[PDB]
RNA sequence: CAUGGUUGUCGUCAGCUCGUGUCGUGAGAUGUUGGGUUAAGUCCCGCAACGAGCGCAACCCUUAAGCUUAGUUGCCAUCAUU
């Protein structure tokens, strides 16, 4: 990536001065109109480092889980994870998705069980109320766990868009020793993320650019 | 007011809990709280919770409309007759 590309995307913006995490002082560049500006040189350096890490893990054969439940990253994370053939979470992170995998896996298998029952002709025999409630359950399961249906083990890396909102994912990943690549905005905590990426998380263009670059890294790996 | 069994009552009020997870030094907590909705912990949304069980609901009985079987001691429509 290039500084001109980042500036065109809008990566430079940050949050107001009223809300801010002083642990990212090194990344803050300047102030403008009661908002902070990120250092794009350090941004590109960290983006290159994250690219290298993601490429190396992909080459080693690990799996990456994308988390973008933020409204400005749902579709971007969805599309980039689909492009890279990886997993994603863009609706809600269920408390215990990784630490309580012993039950989340059963919830995952419920999807395949419902599909098997539907394809085995149990659809019409069951009462109308039963089939409609099963449809509702299947829709909920796809909405929440749709992106990790084929995730049969713990991921080897977690790409998170906005850790401040994705507190749960950060906590579970840190507990389970899963490396994290984060789009850490100004008002976020960099110490939690293993591979920080100073960037504006409120900009659809910026988040899409960064997640696409990471997906390209994974594809190359 | 030593008891079994049986019963009334709040009240058919909507509660009572558990496994895994997570948070707590710990007893514990969460789930089960919040916004709505429902007869209902009923359901949805949200949410470090994810699910499950007993309660709730449903399965049982009866009533309200059809169809198949059966037509006596039930019914009377043609038909004769009382
Ligand atoms: Mg219930
Ligand atoms: Mg009942």
Curated annotation (Swiss-Prot):
One of its GO terms (cellular component) is cytosolic small ribosomal subunit. CDD domains: RPS2. GO terms for biological process: translation. InterPro entries: Ribosomal_uS2, Ribosomal_uS2_bac/mit/plastid, Ribosomal_uS2_CS, Ribosomal_uS2_flav_dom_sf. It holds the Pfam family Ribosomal_S2. SUPFAM superfamilies: Ribosomal protein S2. One of its GO terms (molecular function) is structural constituent of ribosome. Keywords: Ribonucleoprotein, Ribosomal protein. It comes from the Bacteria. Belongs to the universal ribosomal protein uS2 family. This is Small ribosomal subunit protein uS2. It comes from Staphylococcus aureus (strain NCTC 8325 / PS 47). The lineage of its organism: Bacteria, Bacillati, Bacillota, Bacilli, Bacillales. The gene is rpsB.
């Amino acid at each position: 990536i290039s500084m001109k590309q980042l500036l065109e995307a809008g990566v430079h913006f940050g949050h107001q001065t009223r809300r801010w995490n002083p642990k990212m002082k090194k990344y803050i560049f300047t102030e403008r109109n009661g908002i902070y500006i990120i250092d794009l040189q350090k941004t590109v350096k960290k983006v290159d480092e994250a690219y290298n890490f993601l490429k190396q893990v992909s080459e080693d054969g690990g799996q990456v889980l994308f988390v973008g439940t933020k409204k400005q990253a749902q579709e971007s994370v969805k599309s980039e994870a689909e492009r890279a053939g990886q997993f994603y979470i863009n609706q809600r992170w269920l408390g215990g998705l990784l630490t309580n995998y012993k039950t989340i896996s059963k919830r995952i298998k419920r999807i395949s069980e419902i599909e098997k029952m539907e394809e085995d002709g149990l659809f019409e025999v069951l009462p109308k109320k039963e089939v409609v409630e099963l449809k509702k359950e299947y829709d909920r399961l796809i909405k929440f766990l749709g992106g990790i249906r084929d995730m049969k083990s713990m991921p080897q890396a977690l790409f998170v868009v906005d850790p401040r909102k994705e507190r749960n994912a950060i906590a579970e990943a840190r507990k389970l020793n899963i490396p994290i690549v984060g789009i850490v905005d100004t008002n976020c905590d960099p110490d939690e993320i293993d591979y920080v990426i100073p960037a504006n998380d409120d900009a659809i263009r910026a988040v899409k650019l960064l997640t696409a670059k990471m997906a390209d890294a994974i594809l190359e790996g």
